Amino acid sequence: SHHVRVEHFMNHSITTLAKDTPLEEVVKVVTSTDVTEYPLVESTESQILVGIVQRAQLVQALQAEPPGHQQCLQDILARGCPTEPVTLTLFSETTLHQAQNLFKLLNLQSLFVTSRGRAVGCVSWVEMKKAISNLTNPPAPKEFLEVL
């Protein structure tokens, strides 16, 4: 468990929202995902994690002030949409041993993962359990299908 790192088993299927993300794109993201929260990044270019926004809060803000006159996420945040601070995260190089101990002892359900400050994934017990299982029962290699 000391050789397996979070980057090996983390879920890459996360959708980051940036302060400069066009409001049209924000609406598309919110109406196409069902996650409870989204990692907020400084800019689309940097992807530097700076906070967390809860979907329920973002939905409420969008319903109140529906999206020429181009707008971005920062406009909605400046308008009053609540954001949450980042107080704990995993890192790409955090070991499976460290991650499991952290989740167990702090009674956590999930955490975002950063690498060089950038939001790169998330880990929940679903991913953790899969990694632990692979320790003794590694899955068979993935197979491909193609039009020969």
Binding residues for a copy of itself, rule: CB under 8 A, are: 42, 48-50, 85-89, 91-95, 98, 101-102, 105-106, 114, 116-118
Least distance in Å: CB of 113 to a copy of itself?
11
| Choice between 71 and 124, CB closer to Cl ion | 124
Q: Exposed, middle or buried: residue 114 (CB in 10 Å: 0-12, 13-18, 19+)?
A: buried
48's contact among Cl ion, a copy of itself, none, with CB below 5 to 8 A by partner kind, is: a copy of itself
Structure tokens that stand for 139 in this block: 């899955």
Least distance in Å: CB of 92 to a copy of itself?
8
How many Å from the N-terminal Cα to the C-terminal Cα in the chain? 40
148's contact among a copy of itself, Cl ion, none, with CB below 5 to 8 A by partner kind, is: none
Handedness of CA 28, 50, 125, 92 (dihedral sign): positive
User: What is the bridge-based pairing of β-strands 110-115 and 90-91?
Assistant: parallel
| Choice between 13 and 87, CB closer to a copy of itself | 87
Least distance in Å: CB of 114 to a copy of itself?
7
- Candidates 27, 7, 4, 9; CA nearest to 130 is 9
105's contact among a copy of itself, Cl ion, none, with CB below 5 to 8 A by partner kind, is: a copy of itself
Residues near Cl ion, by CB under 5 A? 8-9, 131, 134
9's contact among Cl ion, a copy of itself, none, with CB below 5 to 8 A by partner kind, is: Cl ion
Amino acid at 109: Q
8 A C-beta contact, residue 97 and residue 2: yes
